[PDB]
């Protein structure tokens, strides 16, 4: 429907229900597929890095916000700028007046009010970026999906990208392998790799497309590149 | 907050004149009708209220308002948009002048700024025009006896003797024929009432007939004479009662 | 509550408790019928009320419950026919009786407003009585 | 047409919108009377009556805005709500730049200019309700001005609302043909606001019972409403005669 | 200048004069320092005139609109409202105003603010030039729920010392009764409490 | 016969209104004659679909029991030179010999438009057909004793010459019954049906609100499959329940009318 | 028609059809119940499990404005989430300018003009969602539903969503119960009843429950979310009525 | 047409008609605008066919105002809107 109603994020459907917030779930499933899961110790995010040719350098998903935290854009690449450096100064407002670092469940609930202003307002463009907020604090490993409605659920693990239903079924028959694995993030590592192996068409296997970044108790954040994933792959 | 070209005053008519001024002088054309005339020795202004529900206190709604007792003023125009309209002349014309030479306003001046209000609706995009046409009466000791008509398209003319209404286009001529420049305020007071009666005839009491008139000062009006220099208020509006009274009369 | 009530009703019926009677009628309407009133709910009006006209009947003199009468469809009421089933039976006594209430089943007709003004949309009453109206004057 | 949606004229010269605004009006479809008697202000609203789920005390078309003050509004209730606030603003805003009580007259006048800004401008939009307000003036004594909702303001001696306003409306017009008068004898304020109660019912030809009806009360120096076992007290009284 | 409120049991009166004195010489001598915010809720100004009388007209349109909307304000809630604008106008205004309202479930309440700006409970309070005369003879005779003989006496005999000692306070003495009948206006001449 | 006045019920409010234009003056004319007034010739009966608009002439022809005639819209729109105008020429024709009577119009959405020439598709012959409609209630002819019932989907569709006065003076709308009105028509379609004597009374009324509101008749329809699988040839007031609750997702066509009021 | 193009026109029905269109969204959400008690509320909402993955009882719908008021809203989640982040600012400014908790019938006052401001400006976008609160103040036990065109009234019970009419005949039902109206602890078990019930139609994708309830005999006025062996007690009842 | 030229038509039709000369009629032709000669004659109609459901045969007072709102229906105002002149 070009135009006419719903053309706009004010306007509405004649069922009720903005076509604008299922227009912009289709931007994720463009850009590039992004795995992730975490456990009671350890969390891990696996996103593919594609490219144009040889020549084009793989661009990196994973954008560190914190040093106990991590995000994945799997989205527009502007979107997600404007929402990194918002929640960037807000782990340093956290830390400059609370002291303490920045919650991933609160980061969800100050994120969610972000994507409703350009739909709540008139003009800007909304944000549909899919985005996995990973973290470690007293509470434990958090990981929040970002749904392009602004939606935020918490969940063991999640994919989203092209043909994503692939990587979300091969954590049903995990379910129960992922949580019960407590201290070894040997065996947290490899249960990425095989899951974004489901959803993707078999392109390119080499070590130059999936980044593996993880954070625990005692490894912080960091991100993994190179030889670093050689060791998996 | 802006929002794209809502500031737009693109429209125009294919002749060239604004639209906003057709559709203006359209709804003027068949409201009710008013009148003023101004004579040697005075100015007579006279419209007829409105009816509407039988229930509706004739009191409560007023025509004719007051900025300063040296000038009358009557509407055939929008209703609501005269209260704004004055709030917003006073205003200026206590700002500009009375926070300046703090004095009654002179005829000239006054009008120069009720004309600047009509053109910042129509300036400023999103607000529509003033749909009010007024008729300004003022005596002043320069001039003299003046009286000038506002159209809504924001510009103003002088007038000997005009009306504004449904009957605006009969009462030109009836103006013409009945009234001369050699006849005094007493003479136009009659003509005032004839005029009017002749567009609505259902009830030609003063109950649903405005009338006011600009004499010589009078110092019962002013509430104080403590100063034999200072003039009375020049602006005098008559009782419905005393309405009926000429009307016997007449 | 319909059960509960016709047995509170009753037990200030038997013997009347000499004339209080009216004091022990009207006023539990008051604290009752809050509730009641509305379609089908009625536990006195129809039942309880109509054995309240048949108890003043050739008791006392009808001046008294030609007053009474009148206030309950001056007030509130509900439905006039429940009211105008209780004309029949003032009829039906003073028919019955004649001698001094010949006079009686005339001021029965002017002092009751449902016979004389208008209620209900049935009127039908008013005719039924009016007819024991005319057969007075031609006597 | 694109000649509805706009803001500015029509090529009849007239705006519809200003039309459109009368069509919310009539959603509620409340019969509202007011009338102007000697020294009090009767004013009754109708209540409608949802299910059992709602509360019908805290539903109600009368607002009090200030001392001796009080508003009727026949519309959408939530564009009441935001007028009603704004009345109540201008109110208390009066009294610190003046300290005398508001008059009703002048109340008619801000509420008419600020909904008549909404006209002009091209982002707010006209409010759609009814702003009746009721008081009692000191020097004027009771007045009732029902101000429209494109900023038209006129004084009534029985307002009346909704699709029934015409049997309201001329019941009452006849009624004060005969006594020649816009009060109501009987200066006590009690049965005055009894003998609105039988007009309204013979102009509507249903009786109301005390869960159908609002009735609202302007006294000198107080304001206050009734409340149902004092509208149910005034149907007795108006039972026997 | 001298203010006093003390509760008991059926309500609570605050008690001020009609004095004020600007400098060495006193204006008017009949000048009252009450001012009503509210039916129910009182307040007695002390100090520099001009800082209560803006504060007491700006705060006598914020319960009107908190009642209009809110509900019917108590006599914590219009204590608040004279703390926010002591708050930051400290620096520009001097106010010594207490805030004494009444409640019927509470009886009375009297919250003292000083010109730090602070909201408390007392039973009793005092402020202005004349009241640390008799600040002193307050504590001593005071009672817990007296009654309403009691409480005029109380105030009286307070007054009457801060006008001997101070000479910036004197007049008549002025009271406000609060309680569930209303509120009622009394007053007391020179040739009365001088001689008690 | 098969409904009657008692299978319509709950639109007694509407019910009694067609009586009165209706049956009184097919059964004594001298009430209008009386008064001067001339009795009605046409009627409308509009209103959202599924509310028995057109049960509503089985009821009126169960009870009079005089002539009627049904003429369809579509069915009388056959192609032919100067037939489409004669066809409405006959039914008042007829209506002398064979007593006035009432005459039935259904579902009529075409005649009634004003047909902006794009070729028209050879539907002229359908101009001449509004025509004749529309000069024979303003004819010289005697006319008034026989009553024309036209029904239809939504008013407007219809020609608005018809629509004033003069023409048409009776529009009779059939909204959506009051929650008193619906109660009367659950008894109806669960008469000849075999029930338990737990059968719901003011439940079914509270279930659906919003969703239908009008045809009751679905939910019957659906009671029955639940008590096939019980195993049960008598309904459960359970089942019958959770038919009505059925019925909610069952529409999803929109059609909400504001509109057609006037 | 042309009304629905342009944000808040007037439709010669009265309303605008984006406000219509707004009500039928909060249908396509979840739903969400409420009780009114005598000496409080509660609440009873329901979150949907979209598969296997989701983390048993983490994200919780239920919001508290300040200690002493529950918030809970259905339809769009971050629509709905913005108008409680906006009485959050309105609940503490009135706290600290009049040093005393927000009442419970003034708190829609303040929500009222919010939500009416956006169905006035053109470049504002009106809300589609509807919102319930309620808590014990001052005044005692309170419950008001603010409807996305704006509204609220007192209501003895609350609803919405699509269960809402569903859960309109069990809400009914506690009139008839008692007249004085069920306690605080025995509106939970009924609260949690009515959640099954109204998900019959919704079998098609999992649910979990969440209650919270605010009383002032059990609480002294403070909001708390069921947990421990008062939520197990309440599911097990409504285990074996839907049996 | 104007005001004048329908009590030509109503008094007209009225002479068939039965009615009390205490009809309010003398009111309603204020009321009467922006009418034709078919729309003027579905109104007395009206009149009777109310009388009916009310057993009334003289037309009373009830019959006309209660009678005029039906086939007067055409647009919410009809008269002058509301003011903007």
Redesign the interface.
């Given at each position: 429907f070009r135009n006419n109603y719903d053309g706009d994020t004010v306007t509405f459907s004649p069922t009720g229900r903005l076509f604008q917030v299922e227009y912009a779930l289709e931007a994720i499933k463009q850009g590039s597929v992004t795995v992730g899961l975490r456990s009671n110790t350890h969390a891990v995010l696996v996103a593919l890095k594609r490219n144009a040719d040889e020549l084009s350098s793989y661009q990196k998903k994973i954008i560190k916000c914190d040093e106990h935290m991590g995000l994945s854009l799997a989205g527009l690449a502007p979107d997600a700028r404007v929402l990194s450096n918002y929640l960037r100064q807000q782990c340093n407002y956290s830390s400059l007046v609370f002291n303490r670092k920045l919650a991933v469940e609160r980061a969800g609930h100050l994120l969610c009010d972000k994507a409703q202003k350009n739909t709540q307002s008139y003009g800007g463009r909304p944000y549909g970026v899919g985005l996995l907020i990973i973290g470690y604090d007293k509470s434990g490993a958090h990981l929040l999906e970002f749904q392009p409605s602004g939606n935020v659920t918490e969940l063991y693990g999640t994919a989203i990208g092209a043909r994503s239903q692939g990587a979300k079924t091969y954590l049903e028959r995990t379910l129960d392998t992922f949580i019960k694995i407590d201290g070894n993030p040997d065996e947290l590592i490899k249960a990425g790799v095989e899951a974004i192996s489901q959803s993707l068409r078999d392109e390119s296997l080499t070590v130059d497309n999936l980044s593996i970044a993880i954070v625990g108790k005692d490894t912080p954040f960091t991100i993994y590149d190179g030889e670093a994933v050689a060791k998996y792959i | 907050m802006t929002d794209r070209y809502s500031f737009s005053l693109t429209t125009f008519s294919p002749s060239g004149k604004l639209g906003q001024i057709d559709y203006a002088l359209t709804a003027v054309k068949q409201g009710v009708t008013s009148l003023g005339i101004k004579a040697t020795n005075g100015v007579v202004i006279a419209t007829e209220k409105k009816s509407s529900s039988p229930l509706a206190m004739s009191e409560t709604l007023s025509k004719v308002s007051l900025l300063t007792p040296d000038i009358g003023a009557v509407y055939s125009g929008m209703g609501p948009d005269y209260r704004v309209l004055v709030d917003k002349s006073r205003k200026v014309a206590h700002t500009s002048y009375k926070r300046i030479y703090g004095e009654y306003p002179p005829t000239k001046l006054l009008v120069s700024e009720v004309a600047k209000i009509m053109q910042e609706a129509t300036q400023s995009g999103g607000v529509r025009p003033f749909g009010v046409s007024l008729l300004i009466a003022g005596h002043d000791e320069f001039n003299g006896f003046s009286l000038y008509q506002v159209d809504p398209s924001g510009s103003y003319f002088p007038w000997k003797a005009t009306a504004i209404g449904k009957g605006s286009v009969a009462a030109k001529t009836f103006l013409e024929k009945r009234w001369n420049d050699e006849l005094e305020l007493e003479d136009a007071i009659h003509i005032a009432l004839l005029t009017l009666k002749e567009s609505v005839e259902g009830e030609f009491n003063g109950d649903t007939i405005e009338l006011a008139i600009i004499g010589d000062e009078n110092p019962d009006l002013l509430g104080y004479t403590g100063i034999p220099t200072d003039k009375g208020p020049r602006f005098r509006k008559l009782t419905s009662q005393e309405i009926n009274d000429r009307l016997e009369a007449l | 509550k319909d059960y509960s009530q016709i047995l509170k009703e009753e037990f200030p019926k038997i013997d009347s408790l000499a004339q209080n009677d009216c004091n022990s009628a009207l006023d539990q309407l008051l604290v009752l019928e809050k509730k009641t009133r509305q379609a089908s709910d009625l536990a006195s009006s129809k039942e309880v009320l109509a054995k309240i006209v048949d108890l003043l009947a050739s008791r006392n003199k009808w001046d008294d419950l030609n007053e009474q009468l009148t206030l309950l469809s001056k007030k509130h009421g509900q439905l006039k026919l429940s009211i105008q089933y209780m004309i029949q039976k003032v009829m039906e006594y003073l028919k019955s009786s004649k001698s001094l209430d010949l006079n009686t089943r005339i001021s029965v007709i002017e002092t009751i407003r449902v016979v004389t003004e208008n209620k209900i949309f049935v009127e039908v009453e008013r005719a039924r009585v009016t007819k024991d109206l005319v057969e007075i004057k031609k006597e | 047409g694109y000649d509805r949606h706009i803001t500015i004229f029509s090529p009849e010269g007239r705006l519809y919108q200003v039309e459109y605004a009368f069509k919310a009006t009539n959603q509620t479809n409340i019969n509202s009377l007011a009338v102007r008697g000697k020294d009090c202000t009767v004013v009754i609203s109708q209540k409608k009556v949802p299910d059992k789920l709602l509360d019908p005390t805290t539903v109600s078309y009368i607002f009090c805005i200030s001392r001796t003050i009080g508003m009727v509004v026949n519309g959408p209730i939530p564009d009441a709500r935001n007028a009603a606030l704004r009345a109540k603003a201008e109110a208390a805003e009066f009294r610190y730049k003046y300290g005398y009580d508001m008059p009703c007259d002048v109340l008619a006048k801000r509420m008419a200019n600020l909904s008549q800004i909404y006209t002009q401008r091209a982002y707010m939009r006209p409010l759609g309700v009814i702003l009746t307000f009721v008081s009692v003036d000191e020097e004027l004594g009771p007045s009732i001005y029902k101000t429209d909702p494109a900023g038209y303001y006129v004084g009534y001696k029985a307002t009346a609302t909704g699709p029934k306003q015409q049997e309201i409306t001329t019941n009452l017009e006849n009624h004060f043909k005969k006594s020649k008068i816009d009060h109501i004898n009987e200066e006590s304020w009690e049965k005055v606001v009894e003998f609105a109660i039988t007009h309204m019912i013979d102009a509507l030809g249903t009786e109301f019972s005390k869960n159908d009806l609002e009735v609202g009360v302007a006294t000198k120096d107080k304001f206050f409403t009734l409340s149902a076992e004092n509208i149910e007290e005034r149907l007795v009284a108006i039972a026997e005669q | 200048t001298s203010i006093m409120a003390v509760t008991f049991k059926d309500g609570v009166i605050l008690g001020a004069d009609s004095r004020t004195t600007t400098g060495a010489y006193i204006a008017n001598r009949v000048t009252d320092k009450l001012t009503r915010v509210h039916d129910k809720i009182w307040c007695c100004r002390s100090g520099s005139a001009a800082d209560t009388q803006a504060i007491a007209d700006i705060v006598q349109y914020h319960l009107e609109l908190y009642t209009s909307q809110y509900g019917t304000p108590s006599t914590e809630t219009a204590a608040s409202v004279f703390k926010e604008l002591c708050y930051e106008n400290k620096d520009n205004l001097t106010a010594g105003i207490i805030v004494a309202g009444y409640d019927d479930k509470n009886k009375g309440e009297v919250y003292t603010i000083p010109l730090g700006g602070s909201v408390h409970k007392l039973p009793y309070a005092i402020a202005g030039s004349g009241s640390t005369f008799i600040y002193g003879y307050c504590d001593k005779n005071f009672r817990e729920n007296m009654s309403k003989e009691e409480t005029v006496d109380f105030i009286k005999h307070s007054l009457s010392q801060a006008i001997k000692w101070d000479g910036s306070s004197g007049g008549v003495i002025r009271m406000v009764v609060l309680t569930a009948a209303g509120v009622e206006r009394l007053i007391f001449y020179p040739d009365e409490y001088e001689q008690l | 016969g098969e409904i009657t006045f008692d299978g319509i019920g709950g639109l007694t409010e509407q019910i009694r209104e067609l009586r009165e234009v209706i049956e009184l003056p097919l059964k004594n004319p001298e009430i209008f004659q009386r008064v001067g007034i001339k009795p009605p010739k046409g009627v409308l009966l509009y209103g959202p679909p599924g509310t028995g608009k057109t049960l509503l002439a089985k009821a009126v022809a169960a009870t009079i029991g005089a002539n009627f005639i049904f003429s369809p819209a579509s069915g009388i729109v056959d192609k032919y030179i100067g037939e489409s105008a004669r066809i409405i020429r006959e039914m008042f024709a007829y209506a002398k010999e064979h007593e006035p009577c009432i005459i039935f119009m259904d579902e009529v959405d075409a005649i009634g438009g004003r047909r902006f020439s794009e070729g028209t598709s050879a539907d002229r012959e359908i101009q001449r057909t509004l025509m004749e409609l529309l000069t024979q209630m303003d004819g010289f002819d005697n006319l008034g004793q026989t009553k024309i019932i036209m029904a239809t989907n939504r008013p407007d569709t219809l020609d608005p010459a018809l629509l004033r006065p003069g023409r048409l003076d009776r529009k009779v709308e059939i909204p959506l019954p009051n929650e008193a009105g619906r109660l009367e028509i659950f008894k109806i379609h669960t008469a000849k049906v075999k029930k338990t004597g737990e059968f719901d009374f003011e439940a079914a009324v509270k279930m659906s609100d919003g969703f239908n509101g009008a045809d009751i008749r679905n939910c019957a329809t659906e009671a029955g499959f639940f008590a096939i699988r019980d195993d049960r040839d008598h309904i459960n007031p359970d089942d019958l329940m959770k038919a009505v609750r059925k019925v909610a997702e069952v529409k999803k066509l929109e059609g909400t009318i504001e509109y057609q009021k006037l | 028609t042309?009304?629905?193009?342009?944000?808040?026109?007037?439709?010669?029905?009265?309303?605008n059809?984006?406000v219509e269109?707004?009500?039928?969204?909060?249908?396509?959400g979840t739903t969400s119940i409420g009780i009114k008690c005598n000496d409080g509320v509660v609440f009873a909402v329901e979150k949907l499990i979209?598969?296997?993955?989701?983390?048993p009882q983490?994200?919780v719908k239920i919001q508290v404005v300040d200690r002493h008021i529950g918030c809970v809203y259905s339809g769009?989640?971050?629509?709905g989430?913005?108008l409680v982040?906006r009485g959050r600012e309105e609940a503490a400014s009135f706290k600290?300018?009049?040093?005393?908790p927000?009442?419970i019938?003034?708190f829609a006052?303040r929500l009222?003009?919010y939500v009416?401001?956006?169905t006035?400006?053109?470049?504002?976008?009106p809300f589609?969602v509807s919102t319930i609160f309620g808590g014990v103040d001052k005044?005692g036990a309170h419950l008001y539903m603010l409807?996305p065109?704006?509204?609220y009234?007192?209501?003895?019970?609350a609803?919405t969503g699509k269960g809402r009419?569903?859960a309109?005949?069990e809400?009914?039902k506690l009139?008839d119960h008692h007249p004085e109206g069920l306690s605080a602890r025995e509106a939970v078990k009924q609260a949690a009843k009515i959640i099954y019930l109204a998900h019959?139609?919704n079998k098609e994708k999992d649910f979990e429950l969440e209650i919270s309830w605010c009383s002032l005999s059990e609480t002294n006025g403070l909001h708390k979310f069921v947990k421990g062996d008062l939520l197990q007690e309440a599911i097990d009842f409504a285990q074996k009525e839907i049996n | 047409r104007d005001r004048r030229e329908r009590r030509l038509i109503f008094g007209t039709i009225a002479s068939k008609m039965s009615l009390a000369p205490e009809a309010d009629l003398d009111s309603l032709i204020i009321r009467n605008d922006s009418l034709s000669g078919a729309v003027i004659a579905a109104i007395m109609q009206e009149a009777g066919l109310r009388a009916v459901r009310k057993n009334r045969y003289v037309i009373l007072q009830s019959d006309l105002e209660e009678a005029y709102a039906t086939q007067v229906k055409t647009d919410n105002t009809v008269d002058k809107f509301d003011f903007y002149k």
């Open positions: - | - | - | - | - | - | 042309g009304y629905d193009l342009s944000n808040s026109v007037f439709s010669p029905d009265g309303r059809f984006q269109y707004a009500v039928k969204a909060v249908e396509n979209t598969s296997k993955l989701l983390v983490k994200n769009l989640i971050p629509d989430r913005h982040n600290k300018l009049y040093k005393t927000i009442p019938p003034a006052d009222g003009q009416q401001a956006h006035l400006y053109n470049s504002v976008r589609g005044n409807e065109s704006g509204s009234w007192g209501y003895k019970g609803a009419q569903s309109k005949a809400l009914e009139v019959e139609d | -």
